[PDB]
Design a protein around this ligand. Structure first.
Ligand SMILES: CC[C@@H](C)Oc1cc2c(cc1OC)CC(=O)N(c1ccc(N(C)Cc3ccncc3)cc1)[C@H]2c1ccc(Cl)cc1
Ligand SMILES: [Cl-]
Length: 90
């Protein structure tokens, strides 16, 4: 649902650290978090050049945040769950 993107969130410390490397607020929308995380992934080239939907994060703080070595950007509910576990809904 498009509504979930409007959710107001306060990132936990590790996610806040990651967000500050790409964008400096106390409160974000889920929309903002998704775009900042997306830019983090793209900027750092964490995705497979020949398999672009797969993000590899075992050697990155993003893997610590998410608790996985990798994931597909197509795994939408999983992405939301991994993100939600790193924040407090306001
Ligand atoms: C599951 C939520 C879904 C419903 O909504 C969104 C997804 C995304 C963005 C915004 C969204 O809603 C506002 C911003 C964004 O940029 N995204 C992205 C897309 C492709 C690629 N990659 C690596 C594939 C890619 C393929 C071809 N060229 C460049 C990259 C990397 C990142 C995803 C996204 C995915 C994974 C993570 Cl942890 C955060 C954000
Ligand atoms: Cl890192």
């Amino acid at each position: 649902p498009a509504s979930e993107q409007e959710t107001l969130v306060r990132p936990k410390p590790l996610l806040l650290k990651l967000l500050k490397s790409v964008g400096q607020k106390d409160t974000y929308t889920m929309k903002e978090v998704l775009f900042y995380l997306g830019q983090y992934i793209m900027t750092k080239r964490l995705y497979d050049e020949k398999q672009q939907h797969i993000v590899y994060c075992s050697n990155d703080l993003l893997g610590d945040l998410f608790g996985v070595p990798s994931f597909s950007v197509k795994e939408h509910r999983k992405i939301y769950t991994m993100i939600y576990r790193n924040l407090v809904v306001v």
